[PDB]
Ligand binder design. Sequence first.
Ligand code: HEM
Ligand SMILES: *[C@@H]1O[C@H](CO)[C@@H](O)[C@H](O)[C@H]1NC(C)=O
Ligand SMILES: *[C@@H]1O[C@H](CO)[C@@H](O)[C@H](O)[C@H]1NC(C)=O
Lengths: 98, 96, 100, 108, 107, 94, 94, 79, 80, 457
Amino acid sequence: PHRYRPGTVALREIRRYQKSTELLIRKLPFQRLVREIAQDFKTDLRFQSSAVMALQEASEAYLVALFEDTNLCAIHAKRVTIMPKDIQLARRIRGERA
Amino acid sequence: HRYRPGTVALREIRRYQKSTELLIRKLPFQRLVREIAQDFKTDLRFQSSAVMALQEASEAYLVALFEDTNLCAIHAKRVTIMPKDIQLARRIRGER
Amino acid sequence: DKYRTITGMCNNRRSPTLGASNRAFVRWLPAEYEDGFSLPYGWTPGVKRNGFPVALARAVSNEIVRFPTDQLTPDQERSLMFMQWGQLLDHDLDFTPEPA
Amino acid sequence: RAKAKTRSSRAGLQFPVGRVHRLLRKGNYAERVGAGAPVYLAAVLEYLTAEILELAGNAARDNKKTRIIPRHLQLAVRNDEELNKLLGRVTIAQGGVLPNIQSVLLPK
Amino acid sequence: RAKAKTRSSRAGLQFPVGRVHRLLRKGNYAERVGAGAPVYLAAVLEYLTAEILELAGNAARDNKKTRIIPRHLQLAVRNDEELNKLLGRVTIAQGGVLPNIQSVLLP
Amino acid sequence: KTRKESYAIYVYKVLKQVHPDTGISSKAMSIMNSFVNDVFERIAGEASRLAHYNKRSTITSREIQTAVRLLLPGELAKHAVSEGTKAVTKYTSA
Amino acid sequence: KTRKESYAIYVYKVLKQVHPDTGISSKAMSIMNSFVNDVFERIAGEASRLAHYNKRSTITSREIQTAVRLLLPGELAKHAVSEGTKAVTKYTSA
Amino acid sequence: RDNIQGITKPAIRRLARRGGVKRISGLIYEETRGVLKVFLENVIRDAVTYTEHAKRKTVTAMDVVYALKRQGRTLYGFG
Amino acid sequence: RDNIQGITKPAIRRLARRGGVKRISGLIYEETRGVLKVFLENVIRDAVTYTEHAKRKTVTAMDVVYALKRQGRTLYGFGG
Amino acid sequence: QQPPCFPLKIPPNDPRIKNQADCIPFFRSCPACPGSNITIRNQINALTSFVDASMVYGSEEPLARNLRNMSNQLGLLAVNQRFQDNGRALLPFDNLHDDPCLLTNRSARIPCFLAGDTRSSEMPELTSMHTLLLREHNRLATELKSLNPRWDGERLYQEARKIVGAMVQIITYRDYLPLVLGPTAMRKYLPTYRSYNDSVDPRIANVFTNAFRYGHTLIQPFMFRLDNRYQPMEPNPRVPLSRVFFASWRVVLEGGIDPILRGLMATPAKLNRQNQIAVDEIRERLFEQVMRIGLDLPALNMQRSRDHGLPGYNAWRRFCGLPQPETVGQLGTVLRNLKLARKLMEQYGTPNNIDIWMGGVSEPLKRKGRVGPLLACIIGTQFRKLRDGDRFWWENEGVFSMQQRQALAQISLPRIICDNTGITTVSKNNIFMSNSYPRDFVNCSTLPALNLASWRE
DNA sequence: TCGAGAATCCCGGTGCCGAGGCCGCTCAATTGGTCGTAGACAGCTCTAGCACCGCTTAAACGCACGTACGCGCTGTCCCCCGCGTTTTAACCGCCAAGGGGATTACTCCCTAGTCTCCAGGCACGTGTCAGATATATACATCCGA
DNA sequence: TCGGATGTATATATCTGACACGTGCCTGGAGACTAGGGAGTAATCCCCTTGGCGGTTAAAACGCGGGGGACAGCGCGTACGTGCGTTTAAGCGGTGCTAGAGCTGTCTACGACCAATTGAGCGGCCTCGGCACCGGGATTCTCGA
Ligand code: HEM
Ligand SMILES: *[C@@H]1O[C@H](CO)[C@@H](O)[C@H](O)[C@H]1NC(C)=O
Ligand SMILES: *[C@@H]1O[C@H](CO)[C@@H](O)[C@H](O)[C@H]1NC(C)=O
């Protein structure tokens, strides 16, 4: 039974998803989440498809940049694993949670 | 009599976080500003308020950068700050 | 190291002769010769290059470079000082001597 | 002609409605400026000034002083969440820093 | 009257000078607009567009493709230091990210 | 000497309204003047952008209200809005 | 319907100048149009601020040149300045 | 309406893979969901304010673009 | 003309103390000097551009304030 | 075919040379180290590989000393002892065993000139440029002596030489290179200067000697001379180029260098098109009077590229990172021309065999540039290496003072032209770009002069 | 190193839908004068920026000790990765309604623009009281026995 | 773990300069009036957003085994903190000169503003070829010997 050692398929996925430009979140769940969030501010709101697509693009770009900063924070502490404290440190230095 | 290493450091931390004065001598900073500005224009004059504003901005920038550096150093389970902490803070901030 | 040496020597401290005059050209790519050492492509008749015969430079100038004189198109954005300064800077930079 | 009354008196404000109107007209913001815009802007500016000045005066009283210096303004701003968010990227001259020491550095 | 001649042709540009002048005049920027400001702005905009498009076309050609897609614009912008500094807080839709893996992660 | 208008008299009047027994220095007055100018410019710029977006050529109290809602954070904004509204209402009564 | 203007034909003209045999899609055109509008707004706003600081009522080539120097980074800025200057010179000759 | 769980663990793993992350702890999924919720709440609040000012009931793409630009997050490609 | 060494080690140590730093490595000072030089170069370049546009020869405080506002570092207490 | 001769064979049905057995003369370049065969052949660069105005001051010590005006203590340069142009200095004459200058006109009996380069007498235009630089050096030495009376001859000469070299570097890197490479290539290959780098090799590459031949495509078939009013000056307003080669008598005995400079300043250059590569005057009537038969400049370029053992077109395309064509369709796509690609493939048979010069000048030009992508790559790389590896670069710290740098940064070619001789009307900024009179001409009473007040001790 | 198994990559068909080129209008851009004010000079004053000089003296700079912290180096164990098997719901394709963006009229109000005047808000001058500066004292804290 | 030494907050005098008023004056804000166009209504139009259904299948969920990072513990040495004595320029004053920033006046030429004309760009319409998938093999990388 052939088996890959841990960290091989992870590097393959890193190479594969850094080469494509698609959207990595399913569109229907994201649309539902956006509508649920918008429910608080106003009632009976309609959304253009372009509005939801723009929100998805912005959110995915934000999350990817945050994960890059988190990876740098993890490597700083002599680690490979990504922990929540790394996310908190990145957000604090960026000034989001400062 | 002699204090243990780290007592006077905390005393200075408490003392300089209560004051509002400038921590850099004025004449060396003025000379540095004039030398830097020499590269852009020749025979330049500076208002006193211009040098004062530059000094205030520089001191605020350095203090904030040192706070971020201290956070980075503590993240790696350390007490001293090293140049790599400054580099990481400036890289996350986007200044690199 | 105050002024320029007229021969260009001692400009580089690591290599004093580097960049001076009367020295060999630097090769960015390995040289290509019909024999391998010092023979140009065309010295020996009937020898092909890369599996193809070597063309005559005069013929290439004859039926590719050639164009009738009356169809000259002046350049609306450049003067003849452009070409004159090109030649002057060129005569500054390099010169390959040949035997007399 | 009757006795002139400032628009700030009619609006019940301390900040100048007329000066704000002139600054809006001269500032190259829009082709026309409505009559109610200066009143709204003056009221908002007066509210923000009153809030920050009340906090600074409280800080000065806590420091046992009867005059506001930049240190008191910085202490007032940095101790309030909304004001700190409003002035996050703002430097106050001769303001100092908020005293905090990480718990890791304290002796154990 | 004489035959009409566009200001872009007079200045030797491809970007419009009359439209840029109108946008400056009606954009609430200043009380008056000079006659040489639209020409300068159009020239600068044309230069920046040419830079971006040349880099993007080179990226597309290296990809064995004829058309330019947002991925090529992203590759052009992010691989250039000055352009990356200019568009440092800008997200290009469908642009992806640059391939970059940290050395410590590699086996 | 050329006149130099500033928000010093009005800031002092507000301070006397809030803290009758507290004064202010000159550097603090300069800081408050800069703060007032900065907030004015921010709100006015946001209102101008809002007017441009909707293809309108007028800055009204609705634009100022929306700019205050956009810029000021959380509870602050709410209170500010209330104050502004009150003023306009009083200004309409007179 | 209506009439919506954009920097579409000019971007295509520049592209055909640079890459005569290379096309461009619709999303790429949208990105280029947004980029042109964004840079225009940045330079125009900086020039307006420069004119306001020096108590002038006119935006001229000097304001545009200074705005380009302030905004555009590094050698890029230098090249841009040259281009702009050339255009104005030509515009004066004809 | 628990639609925050629609952002699944494999989706977060894909987003982290695009960011260059090799190993992932099991506690970052909830943190990522909270961060995304905060960001979306801010942007959507600004967009809804822009929509309400125009006296509309439909959130257009331009409202989202303006809301993002207000936060220093300019987005190209949607006008 | 080596005035960057006028930013002495005690001054950097004081600036670190105000930031809450307890222990400082020996190579921090050169890095701090480089960071300060970069920041000052950017700000002074912008201020000198602002001064040149006005056809003046003295760099006023307002030019520095405008440059800092351009970098996103608004400063209160000087000018307006 | 015996060394050191590499004559050019004549193909059949030649337009000019009817006899096939005849051959165009050609001499192979000198080897770097003759007498051996294991070592690969290399060529000799007889000049310093720096932008230091080594065409006016020479590159070898004996010639450099012989150029100096060694009879006084003013640090001047030698001038002609028999002729002058309206009382202005001319280049000193030179004595040679076989002077080609006298072959052009036996009646005139005017020899070739002497300068820092042996080729300073190809035409009146190059001689005019050399004379202008010589006059500029003499004027700078005179001004420096007048301003500083304590300086001796050697110090004055060295300071004037340094200023002239810095002026040449400034003019080149600020006006000429952007107009060759274009904005994109100039930004890519010559970014902003950082500092002197001792690891950078400033030696001239072997391909650069054939990749800078591109200027052979800008040559006009005539030499134009204009009077003070920028009108065709009589007699002989336009002279065929075949009669101005190695003709120094057209400078001393035909009104000096003023008409030549005026014609250069106000005449459009030739545009390089894929169907019009090089004019027929240099292709069929080059050095007609000096030699037995006319030469062929493109043929000489290709033959020299073959002699130097340079790789083909595709090797340099790979070196510069550009795509490498393999078939006729790929070549037509790359060159944006199908007829030219078909002709090239018929001539050579494969793109790998195309000579560097032909392929470089056959490419479509860059936007606002005069070279293709490959030639732009080579030229930009060479000039970047020249700038970064030069310890005496004018922008390097310690070479010039800051006040001196600000004084030098305001020089321009039209200022020198209307300062050092009699022309009063000159072209506007970027003299290399202005060619229409009087649309873009000024009286140079508005251009500021060089401020030497910062050179006072 | 050597071989088996996956994974990714490099080439010939095959449609298809989006990018590119062609007409028709109409609505800005261009051309041709008028005018009035914004800015480009010149003069001139006086404020503040630069330079210099002498004296304290507080800061910086070397030097020596030692201790506490940074940094490797084990060792365990448990948490995350890779893979296979079931669910689940995202996704695509097609219909049907209707809410609500989006133009198009028309007509008021609301704002700009102009004199007139006349008080609110600057600049300048003054004096007194918060606050900065010694001086001694008394708690507070730390390090050692 | 009770006593000694250093450091810092506290209360009381002394002096000073800067902040809080007072006063004169000028200029910008308020009070009227008129005129024109921007925006507020209303009334259609049709577009595109929401809601529904059905089938296919790709991805999300669960479970399992194992190995390789995370984290704790333990030396070891070196480099940074703490005093201490010796330079060294920083800061404070008073002095002097002059460059240039700011203000005043004149005037001219440049940009806003009209009208009349027309052609450049936008919308709608075809149409065909670049690209996205299909099949197959080819080459490379990885993990167990
Ligand atoms: C304008 C008329 C010119 C004539 C009549 C001329 C003549 C010649 C000839 C016959 C050679 C023989 C070797 C060679 O071709 O490389 C040569 C050398 C050369 N030329 Fe030209 N040339 C001219 C212009 C230029 C220009 C304008 C440039 C550059 C912009 C240039 C670049 C070179 C170079 C690099 C050499 C090599 C030096 C050597 O081989 O001795 N030439 N010149
Ligand atoms: C240069 O030498 C020449 C020889 O012809 C002589 O006439 C001249 O005077 C010398 N230069 C000077 C400056 O004297
Ligand atoms: C000098 O040039 C080399 C070769 O290009 C480069 O690798 C190196 O970084 C440069 N050094 C500096 C100090 O710029």
